[PDB]
Each structure stands twice: as C-alpha cells, then as structure tokens.
C-alpha cells in the first residue's frame, strides 16, 4: 500500500535473535507443542 504500487527492496533474511549466551543461565523449556507438518 505504501495508493498501492509495486515497490522494490533488499530482501530480509529474517529477524535478528541475539541469544543470551553466558557461562551459565541454561534455557530449559517448561511446555511443548505437538506439531504436524
């Protein structure tokens, strides 16, 4: 929409995720999801 027109752009590879790495602070999941693909 930017009235809508064709726009050109540099493609994004994805959102940046800065993993909170440290000498400690393990990340453990408390739940789960049953996914069918």
């Amino acid at each position: 929409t930017q009235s809508q027109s064709i726009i050109a752009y540099t493609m994004s590879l994805g959102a940046e995720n800065s993993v909170a790495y440290s000498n400690n602070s393990i990340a453990i999941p408390t739940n789960f999801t049953i996914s069918v693909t």
Binding site: A20, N23, N24, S25, I26, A27, I28, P29, T30, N31, F32, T33, I34, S35, V36, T37
Partner: protein, 233 residues
C-alpha cells in the same frame, strides 16, 4: 501425566492440516508441476507434427500428391529427420525427468521406512523438530507424510553448573543438567523442566573438587545415609 493435553494438541494439528491443505492451492505444487510437465511434453511432441522443418508442407499426403517421387523422397526425408529429432528430444527429456522422479521416489521410500516404520533421530529428516511418528497418505503420483514432531516451548532461564562439589568430590549428572532457580539447585531433563532433588542415585562421582572449571558447592543428599540416620538413637 499430560496425555489429554498431548492428545488434544495432536487432534488440533490434524484438524489444521485439512485447513492448510484445503485453503492453500500450492500445497500439491510438486505433483501438479510433474503432471503439467508431462502434459506440456506431450503437447509439444504432438504440435511438432505441424512444423515443416524446411519442407514445403507438414502433410505427407500433400507432398506425395503435389510432387513427383524423386523430390518427394527428399521432402519426406526432411520431415522424418525433423520428427525423429523431436522424438529423440522428448525421450531424452523423459529420461531426465524419470531419473529425477526415481531420486524423489527413493527419498520417499527412505523417509517411509525411517519415519513411518520407525523413529528417526536424523534432524529435519522426518519433519521440523524432534520426530515422534509419521503418517503416510496416498496422493496422485505421489505421497504425503504427516510428520508428528516434538517442539519445545515456554523456556525459562536457570543458573547452571557443569558439576557440584559436596565432600571434595565432583558429582556429574547421569541424565540431565544441574539447574538453579536462584537459591536452590535441582536436576532436570534437558528437553523438559522437571526439577528433581540431587541425590547419589542421580549423579556419579569422578575427579576431585579442584579439577572442574565452574564447579559449585551444593549438598548431595544420600538416601542410604539418611535411612541409616533414622534407625539410630
């Protein structure tokens, strides 16, 4: 303990599969492209009969009726060369597509054997996530696999340590990881948070208190020693 929840999640995912297939038209794109490529190959092969290939006409009867046998021979020879080149191109393209389909079918049979007939630990081979099981589905000139995967969710942060030192000895987890909620230390699974009291039955002794880098000081409860302290005046 969470059987009903997992069953409901599986039922909801199976129900959403039908919606993701009935709504999205590009779900069967591979099979549709195979069918369309075969149809286009056949249509091109049958339309190449209308090409003259430098001859006076594409009809053999017209060439035979209009021209004398001497030059009709070379006209028919040009037509034969053109149609034979068309047939050879069609057969070569069919061989290439058949090799591609053979590779795809070998992959499909491998995935059937390793996901439906068993449980595979190959990452991203039987779906995205920890593969539980797969269900095959018959498709026109193809096959559809319903990969049931285990996806972790709702992760929390816990202070961890490689080992613990209680009586000058380093204790390492047999199965799990040492975690801390801030004040107390527990042992839990790596893929699911289930805090357990660190005991001798959950850990093993190796080395001393000074060899491990990052070791922490925490008590290791011994059930055998605790039971002996109960039967003592």
């Amino acid at each position: 303990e969470n059987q009903k929840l997992i069953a409901n999640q599986f039922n909801s995912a199976i129900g959403k599969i039908q919606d993701s297939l009935f709504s999205t038209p590009s779900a069967l794109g591979k099979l549709q492209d195979v069918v369309n490529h075969n149809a286009q190959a056949l249509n091109t092969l049958v339309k190449q009969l209308s090409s003259k290939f430098g001859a006076i006409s594409s009809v053999l009867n017209d060439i035979l009726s209009r021209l004398d046998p001497p030059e009709a021979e070379v006209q028919i020879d040009r037509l034969i060369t053109g149609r034979l080149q068309s047939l050879q191109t069609y057969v070569t393209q069919q061989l290439i597509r058949a090799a591609e389909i053979r590779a795809s079918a070998n992959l499909a049979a491998t995935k059937m054997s390793e996901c439906v007939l068993g449980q595979s630990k190959r990452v991203d081979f039987c779906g995205k996530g920890y593969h539980l099981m797969s269900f095959p589905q018959s498709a026109p000139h193809g096959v559809v696999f319903l990969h049931v995967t285990y996806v972790p969710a709702q992760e929390k942060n816990f202070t961890t340590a490689p080992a613990i030192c209680h009586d000058g000895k380093a204790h390492f987890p047999r199965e799990g990881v040492f975690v801390s909620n801030g004040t107390h230390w527990f042992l839990t699974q790596r893929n699911f948070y289930e805090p357990q009291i660190i005991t001798t039955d959950n850990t093993f002794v190796s080395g001393n208190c000074d060899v491990v880098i990052g070791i922490v000081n925490n008590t290791v409860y011994d059930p055998l020693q605790l039971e002996l302290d109960s039967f003592k005046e």
